[PDB]
């Protein structure tokens, strides 16, 4: 009377990737649109005055980023 029940996947099987260099990361900076970027590319866009999102282009703000 002992056996798994919730799915059959062990350990976290998923990650993120930058929407620029496709750099696979664990904790990206999800903007206010959804897409994600890497520390680099991220710091680059934000330093563009009007950072949107290379992906679709919406808005990239460290404060609004996670
Ligand atoms: Zn990148
Ligand atoms: Zn986007």
Curated annotation (Swiss-Prot):
A zinc finger (RING-type) spans 33-42. Undergoes 'Lys-48'-linked polyubiquitination, leading to its proteasomal degradation in response to signaling by TNFSF13B, TLR4 or through CD40. 'Lys-48'-linked polyubiquitinated form is deubiquitinated by OTUD7B, preventing TRAF3 proteolysis and over-activation of non-canonical NF-kappa-B. Undergoes 'Lys-63'-linked ubiquitination during early stages of virus infection, and 'Lys-48'-linked ubiquitination during later stages. Undergoes both 'Lys-48'-linked and 'Lys-63'-linked ubiquitination in response to TLR3 and TLR4 signaling. 'Lys-63'-linked ubiquitination can be mediated by TRIM35. It is found in: Cytoplasm; Endosome; Mitochondrion. There is a cross-link at residue 21 (Glycyl cysteine thioester (Cys-Gly) (interchain with G-Cter in ubiquitin)). It comes from the Eukaryota. Belongs to the TNF receptor-associated factor family. A subfamily. It is linked to Immunodeficiency 132A: An autosomal dominant immunologic disorder characterized by increased susceptibility to infection with certain pathogens, including Herpes simplex virus and Mycobacterium abscessus. Immunologic work-up shows impaired production of cytokines, including INFB and IL6. Homotrimer. Heterotrimer with TRAF2 and TRAF5. Interacts with LTBR/TNFRSF3, TNFRSF4, TNFRSF5/CD40, TNFRSF8/CD30, TNFRSF13C TNFRSF17/BCMA, TLR4 and EDAR. Interacts with MAP3K5, MAP3K14, TRAIP/TRIP, TDP2/TTRAP, TANK/ITRAF and TRAF3IP1. Interaction with TNFRSF5/CD40 is modulated by TANK/ITRAF, which competes for the same binding site. Interacts with TICAM1. Interacts with TRAFD1. Interacts with OTUB1, OTUB2 and OTUD5. Interacts with RNF216, OPTN and TBK1. Identified in a complex with TRAF2, MAP3K14 and BIRC3. Interacts with BIRC2 and BIRC3. (Microbial infection) Interacts (via N-terminus) with New York hantavirus glycoprotein N (via C-terminus); this interaction inhibits the formation of TRAF3-TBK1 complexes. The MATH/TRAF domain binds to receptor cytoplasmic domains. Cytoplasmic E3 ubiquitin ligase that regulates various signaling pathways, such as the NF-kappa-B, mitogen-activated protein kinase (MAPK) and interferon regulatory factor (IRF) pathways, and thus controls a lot of biological processes in both immune and non-immune cell types. In TLR and RLR signaling pathways, acts as an E3 ubiquitin ligase promoting the synthesis of 'Lys-63'-linked polyubiquitin chains on several substrates such as ASC that lead to the activation of the type I interferon response or the inflammasome. This is TNF receptor-associated factor 3. It comes from Homo sapiens (Human). The lineage of its organism: Eukaryota, Metazoa, Chordata, Craniata, Vertebrata. The chain holds residues 43 to 101 of 568 of the full protein.
């Amino acid at each position: 009377g002992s056996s798994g029940s919730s799915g059959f996947v062990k350990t976290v099987e998923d990650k993120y990737k930058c929407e620029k260099c496709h750099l696979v990361l664990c904790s990206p900076k999800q903007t206010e649109c959804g897409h994600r970027f890497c520390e680099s590319c991220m710091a680059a866009l934000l330093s563009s005055s009007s950072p949107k999102c290379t992906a679709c282009q919406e808005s990239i703000v460290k404060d609004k980023v996670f």
